[PDB]
Design a protein around this nucleic acid. Structure first.
Ligand SMILES: [Mg+2]
Ligand SMILES: [Mg+2]
Ligand SMILES: [Mg+2]
Ligand SMILES: [Mg+2]
Ligand SMILES: [Mg+2]
Ligand SMILES: [Mg+2]
Ligand SMILES: [Mg+2]
Ligand SMILES: [Mg+2]
Ligand SMILES: [Mg+2]
Ligand SMILES: [Mg+2]
Ligand SMILES: [Mg+2]
Ligand SMILES: [Mg+2]
Ligand SMILES: [Mg+2]
Ligand SMILES: [Mg+2]
Ligand SMILES: [Mg+2]
Ligand SMILES: [Mg+2]
Ligand SMILES: [Mg+2]
Ligand SMILES: [Mg+2]
Ligand SMILES: [Mg+2]
Ligand SMILES: [Mg+2]
Ligand SMILES: [Mg+2]
Ligand SMILES: [Mg+2]
Ligand SMILES: [Mg+2]
Ligand SMILES: [Mg+2]
Ligand SMILES: [Mg+2]
Ligand SMILES: [Mg+2]
Ligand SMILES: [Mg+2]
Ligand SMILES: [Mg+2]
Ligand SMILES: [Mg+2]
Ligand SMILES: [Mg+2]
Ligand SMILES: [Mg+2]
Ligand SMILES: [Mg+2]
Ligand SMILES: [Mg+2]
Ligand SMILES: [Mg+2]
Ligand SMILES: [Mg+2]
Ligand SMILES: [Mg+2]
Ligand SMILES: [Mg+2]
Ligand SMILES: [Mg+2]
Ligand SMILES: [Zn+2]
Lengths: 240, 16, 108, 45
RNA sequence: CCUCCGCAUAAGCCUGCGUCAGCUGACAAUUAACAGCCCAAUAUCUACAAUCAACCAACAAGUCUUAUUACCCUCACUGUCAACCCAACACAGGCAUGCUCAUAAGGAAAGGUUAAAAAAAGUAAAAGGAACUCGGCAAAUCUUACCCCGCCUGUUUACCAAAAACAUCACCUCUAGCAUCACCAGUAUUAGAGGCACCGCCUUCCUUAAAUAGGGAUGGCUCCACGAGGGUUCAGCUGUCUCUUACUUUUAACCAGUGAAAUUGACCUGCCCGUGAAGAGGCGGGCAUAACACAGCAAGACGAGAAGACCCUAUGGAGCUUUAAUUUAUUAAUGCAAACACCUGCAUUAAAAAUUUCGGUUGGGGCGACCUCGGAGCAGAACCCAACCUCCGAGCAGUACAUGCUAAGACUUCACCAGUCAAAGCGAACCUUUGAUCCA
RNA sequence: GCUAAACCUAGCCCCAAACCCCACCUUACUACCAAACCUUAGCCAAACCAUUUACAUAAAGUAUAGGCGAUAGAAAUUGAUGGCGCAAUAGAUAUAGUACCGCAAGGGAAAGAAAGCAUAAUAUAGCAAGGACUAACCCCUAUACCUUCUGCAUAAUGAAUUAACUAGAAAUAACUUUGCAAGGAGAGCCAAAGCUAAGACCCCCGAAACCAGACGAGCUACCUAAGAACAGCUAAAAGAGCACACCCGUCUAUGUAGCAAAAUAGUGGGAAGAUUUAUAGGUAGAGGCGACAAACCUACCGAGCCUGGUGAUAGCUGGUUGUCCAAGAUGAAUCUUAGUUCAACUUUAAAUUUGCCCACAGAACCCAAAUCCCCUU
C-alpha cells in the first residue's frame, strides 16, 4: 500500500498537527489492530516529555510559566502550554497545575532533598524517598515514558548508590539511575476513571469501533488448553 | 441459482 | 402448461383453414351511381367523401384566415360563395367565406 | 438489485487498468506482452 | 388530464429525433468571462474551534506563513452538442449536488370496439360485527390491559429468516514496564484479548357459553424505558366472515399492426371393466363414435420447468473439529557446536499449521453384534451346496527330539495361493489349527 | 412455387531447406524539472494414500532403483522442395484476435460463391401399417424406437424435425501367407525348425475438484483523506418525540422468461446520528474484510475469477454409425459385493481317441426321491 506515516514533522512546534487516522492498519494496508476506526477528527499537539530541556545557548535549572492547561484529544492526561525564556512547549499537566503557576525544571542533585513542589521536575536523586512522581525516564535524558496517563502516580520507593527504585502505577518496581528526571505529583485529570461512556456512540466518537474476527488464526479465538500426559489421558474428561 | 446465458449479438443483429 | 406433443400440419390445417377462420366474402359492395365508385351500402362513398373533405378543408382554411386567432367564433351565420356569386337577400348579415374556385356541381 | 456493478469513472479505469499501472509491475508487463502476442488491438485499458 | 416533476452542475457517455435527400448517406455544429490546466525557493512562522459567535451551553476538542534572495514577459491550451449514464432493451430499477414546491418547467394513463367468465386494483353495501382464520392476515377504525424475550438507539443472512442472534454503554478475567510504519508519535486512570450484559436489591383459581390458548396461586430476584420481536385481552372498527352483491379501471374477448417462451418420438390422441414393469387414449372384453372452429375448466396426460426435494451408493469431492495418522519444512523458545549483539548448523519442546483417511456385513424405537478356522443339522444315500439360519468348538497343548532325508503315485475345500496322504529307498531306531509377500 | 438447395478457391496443414515525419512508461501514443536474480506445485498412477509415479540405432527395458510395488531406469561400447494433407461446420481462432462478451486478466465468432410450407383442411376406429381389395377408408392382424434392466406399451431414460459434423488408437504371444532354412535377419537379436516380412486386435462426451501463475475492493465488507445533506412541528445542546427529503425493507397483495436474474403498490422502521451519501485511495483468495449471517469480496463464495497443468480423474450416467450368416446363458478372493482377477461357461483353430447314455457288481456304521461308478447298446 501507499501508506506513509503522518509522523513526518521533524521540528517541534506548538501548533496542533493534522494527524491521519490509521484504522488499525499497517503500512501494508491490512488490519493489524482491531476495533480502531472513525471517531472525531483530531489534531496532535507535540508534547515535550523531556522536562529538563534547557533552551538553546542556555543551561542550568530554569523556570517556566504555565500559560494554560488544556484538554488533549490524544491523551487521558490534560496538557499544559508552558513558556520559558523565549520558547513555549506542551507538557503533561499535573493534578493541581493552574494557569499562571510557576514550574521549576532542574538537573541539580542537591546533597539534601529538595522541597518537592507539585509540577516541578528534578532528578530522582534530589527527591525525598516516598514522593509521588510521574513522567519518569528510563535513562538519563531519554525522555519521560512511564507514569503518563491521567491520574497516575509512581512512588520513589528507594534511593541507593546512583540507583533509585520506583513503583510504577502497575505496582511493579523499576530501577533507574538517579540522574534521570521526573516531575512531582500525580498526572492531571485524576477523574478519568470515573468517566462513564454512557452509549456506544461515544466510543465511536472516541474512535473505537466494534470489530469481530480479531484473531485471523484458523478457528478464531482459542483459549489455551492443558494437554494431558499419557498417564492422565485416561481421566481427561471422565464421562458422568 | 444458475446465471442466464446470453447468445452472441451478431446472430440477432443481422440485416439484409 | 406446455404442449405434450407437436401439432401436425394436418391438424393445423384443419384448424386454420376452417370456415370460421376464413375471410368472409362481402356482399354489400356496390357502385356509387353518382361517380361510379365502389362503396358499401351503409357507408359513404370514399371518393365522394374525400372530395367533400378537401373542399371542407379549403373552406375552413378561409374561415381561419378570416377569423384570425383562437376564440374568434362568430355569433352570426356563415355562407360560402364561389367565383361569380353574389350574396343573396337571405345571405345578408352572414359572414361570407370567399372561395377562388368555381361552384362545385355537387355543392348547391 | 444486481447487474449494475459497473459504475464508470475514468480515473478508476486508468488507475486500475491503465498502461502505466500495467508497466508498473513485471506481472503487468507480462499481461501487456501476452496481449501483444495475441495481437490485441487494445493492449491496456 | 397528469408529474417529487423540472432546469442546471458533477459524473458518465461520445454526436446518439439539427438540415438535406434516399434507418442510410451527406452536410453542419459546442467560440470563454464558467470550469480545468498553477504557484521560485530557503528557512522561520503559525496554543486561543464551530454553532448568526455576542451571552449562553459544552465535549467528541474540531484546514490551518511572513523576511530575504531571484523575477516583468501576459490571457496560451482543453471541456462546452443530445432526447445522454449503470442495468443485454426506447428496462416501472440504480443514479451526487444547487435551485423551482408545484411548477413560468416537463409530460399523456385510452390503437378501435364490446361489456362474457376467471384474474388484478378500487369504491359502496341491508342486519350482524371476528362468528373468518394458524393468527383480526387484509381492510376499516379508535383503544385498553397484561405476559415472555432482549436493557435501550443500532447491526445482520444484497436475492425466502430483522429476530430472542450480533453489537452496545456497565462489569469481570487474562496479557504487557515499553518508543520512531499499526498499537502510538500512545505508557497501567494505558494498550491488546476474552467473557458477560444497562442498572438496582438480597445470598387448583381467573379469563370464555365452551379456553390443548393466556394470566395467577456465585445464585435468587428487581422490566425504568424501548421493540415493524413473540403471545393474550377489553372496547371499537370493519365484506375477514354469515353470504355475497353492484359499479369503475385493468385484464379480458372481437377488429387492425407487430409478434415471443417453456414444450414437442410419431400420433388418425374416446368411456367402462380387466390386465400389465403391479395406475392404460393405444393391450383383452364391452360401450360410444360424421367433420371441423371459438370461449371456459383444470380431473388425467404418473402434465412443463434444475440429470427437483428427501434417502442410499462412490476405496467421488470439499469444509469443520479433534486425545485420527504422518510431519515440523517455517516461526518462538531453549540446549549444543560455530563466529567473538548478530548470525549459521544440529537437536529438543511448543505454537502454528500442512498432507491424508473415514473397511465391510448386519441392527428402525438403540447404547451393538460380527469378520479367520473347525464339528453337527439344514444338506437322510458319491461329491457339492446359503443364511441376519439352528447348535458347538479353536487360536494350542502334551509328547518325543529320526517327531530324520529322500521319493513313485495320488487327494485337494469348487480358481490360485495354500493344504493333505504316501509305496519303494537311505538313515536312526524296534507322535495326537491356523497368517502370505516385502521388510528386518 | 416459395424457402431453399448446390458450387471452388480464399486460404490453411504437415515436411524439407534457410537461422529470422510526429507522439508514446504521466491518465501510453502527452514538446519542455533536481530499480531484477531465489527448489515449481498439484492434477494424475499406485485401483484410497502418506515414500514413490507424474514437468539415430544397438547394448536394453539390461545393470540398477523402488511402500523391492505402482513403476522408474542408465552407462561403458556402437556410429548416423514435396504431399494415397483439408477445401468455407474442413483446414489456422482467423475475412479477425476483428465484431461481440468481461472492470480486468481473459473469452472469442459468423460469413463468399432436405426439413418447413403452398398448390390442395377435414369424415366413425385408434403406433397409423400390413394382408388385401374392383375400391382411399370401412374388414382382419398388429402393445413406437433407443438405452437401462430379472422383466418396459409402459405412466422409466433420450429424441420437434432436416442438413452437416460427431466415437476402437497398440503390444506380448499366437494364427495365416510368403522367403530362406540348422540357420534367419541389410551388424545389435533370436535359434534344440527356427528366423525374417506382412496380414488381424484394444472408443467418445461429462464432474465436483487440486495446484501454479495472473486479474479483480467502479458491486459489496471494512478502513483512510478531504467533502456534502438532513423540511416543518415538538422540544432544548438529546445515539430525544412526530414527521418530509433521504436511508432501510416489517407486513400484505401483485409479479414469477416479470418493468425487474429480487421489481411494483400500499403498509411500515430510522430520519442530528453508531446517520446517509458523492469523490479518490487501501486491504486479494486459505487470503482479505466481517456490530459472526459461513456475511461479503463484480448477479451463481463453506472459500473469487481467468489462464495453464488439462484431453485432470470418474469402478458412475449417456453415446458408440454398412449388409449377411454362424456358434453363443446364471464358485473363490477382494477397503469387496455399482468393480476386478482366477475358475466355470463361451468362441476360434489344431492334435488324436474315446466321450455321454448305461444295466449287473459296488459305495457305513452311528442313528425318501434319488445319486455316484460302467460291460454293452
Ligand atoms: Mg458506488
Ligand atoms: Mg397512451
Ligand atoms: Mg386495447
Ligand atoms: Mg355491511
Ligand atoms: Mg374464532
Ligand atoms: Mg373484539
Ligand atoms: Mg372456524
Ligand atoms: Mg394489519
Ligand atoms: Mg433489542
Ligand atoms: Mg434475505
Ligand atoms: Mg441491509
Ligand atoms: Mg425479510
Ligand atoms: Mg384465539
Ligand atoms: Mg430498533
Ligand atoms: Mg391480433
Ligand atoms: Mg386400468
Ligand atoms: Mg400414453
Ligand atoms: Mg379448447
Ligand atoms: Mg439424479
Ligand atoms: Mg482343487
Ligand atoms: Mg490414486
Ligand atoms: Mg551411450
Ligand atoms: Mg473455419
Ligand atoms: Mg420439400
Ligand atoms: Mg417412454
Ligand atoms: Mg434413470
Ligand atoms: Mg424429451
Ligand atoms: Mg471502494
Ligand atoms: Mg430537522
Ligand atoms: Mg432521534
Ligand atoms: Mg456492518
Ligand atoms: Mg452463528
Ligand atoms: Mg450456521
Ligand atoms: Mg462472482
Ligand atoms: Mg474421461
Ligand atoms: Mg444361431
Ligand atoms: Mg484388504
Ligand atoms: Mg464399484
Ligand atoms: Zn361516389
Amino acid at each position: 500500500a501507499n501508506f506513509v506515516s503522518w509522523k513526518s514533522r521533524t521540528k517541534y512546534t506548538i501548533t496542533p498537527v493534522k494527524m491521519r487516522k490509521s484504522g488499525g492498519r499497517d503500512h501494508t494496508g491490512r488490519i493489524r489492530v482491531h476495533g480502531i476506526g472513525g471517531g472525531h477528527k483530531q489534531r496532535y499537539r507535540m508534547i515535550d516529555f523531556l522536562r529538563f530541556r534547557p533552551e538553546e545557548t542556555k543551561s542550568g535549572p530554569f523556570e517556566e510559566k504555565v500559560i494554560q492547561v488544556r484538554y488533549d484529544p490524544c491523551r487521558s492526561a490534560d496538557i499544559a502550554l508552558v513558556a520559558g525564556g523565549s520558547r513555549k512547549r506542551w507538557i503533561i499537566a499535573t493534578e493541581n497545575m493552574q494557569a499562571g503557576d510557576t514550574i521549576l525544571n532542574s538537573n541539580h542533585i542537591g546533597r539534601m532533598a529538595v522541597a518537592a513542589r507539585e509540577g516541578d521536575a528534578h532528578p530522582l536523586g534530589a527527591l525525598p524517598v516516598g514522593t509521588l512522581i510521574n513522567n519518569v525516564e528510563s535513562e538519563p535524558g531519554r525522555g519521560a515514558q512511564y507514569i503518563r496517563a491521567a491520574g497516575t502516580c509512581g512512588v520513589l520507593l528507594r534511593k541507593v548508590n546512583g540507583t533509585a527504585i520506583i513503583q510504577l502505577p502497575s505496582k511493579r518496581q523499576m530501577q533507574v539511575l538517579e540522574t534521570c528526571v521526573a516531575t512531582v505529583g500525580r498526572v492531571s485529570n485524576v477523574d478519568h476513571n470515573k468517566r462513564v461512556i454512557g452509549k456506544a456512540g461515544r466510543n465511536r466518537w472516541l474512535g473505537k469501533r466494534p470489530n469481530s474476527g480479531r484473531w485471523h488464526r484458523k478457528g478464531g479465538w482459542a483459549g489455551r488448553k492443558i494437554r494431558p500426559l499419557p498417564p492422565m489421558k485416561s481421566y481427561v474428561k471422565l464421562p458422568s | 441459482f444458475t446465471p442466464p446465458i446470453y447468445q452472441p449479438k451478431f446472430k440477432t443483429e443481422k440485416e439484409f | 402448461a406446455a404442449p405434450k406433443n407437436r401439432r401436425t400440419i394436418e391438424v393445423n390445417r384443419c384448424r386454420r383453414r376452417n370456415p370460421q377462420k376464413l375471410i368472409k366474402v362481402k356482399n354489400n359492395i356496390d357502385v356509387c351511381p353518382e361517380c361510379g365508385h365502389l362503396k358499401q351500402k351503409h357507408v359513404l362513398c370514399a371518393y365522394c367523401y374525400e372530395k367533400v373533405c378537401k373542399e371542407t378543408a379549403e373552406i375552413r382554411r378561409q374561415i381561419g384566415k378570416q377569423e384570425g386567432g383562437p376564440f374568434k367564433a362568430p355569433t352570426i351565420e356563415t355562407v360560402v360563395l364561389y367565383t361569380g356569386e353574389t350574396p343573396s337577400e337571405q345571405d345578408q348579415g352572414k359572414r361570407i367565406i370567399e372561395r377562388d374556385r368555381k361552384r362545385p356541381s355537387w355543392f348547391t | 438489485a444486481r447487474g449494475n456493478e459497473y459504475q464508470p469513472s475514468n480515473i478508476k479505469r486508468k488507475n486500475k487498468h491503465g498502461w502505466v499501472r500495467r508497466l508498473s509491475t513485471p506481472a503487468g508487463v507480462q499481461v501487456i506482452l501476452r496481449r501483444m502476442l495475441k495481437g490485441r488491438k487494445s493492449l491496456s485499458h
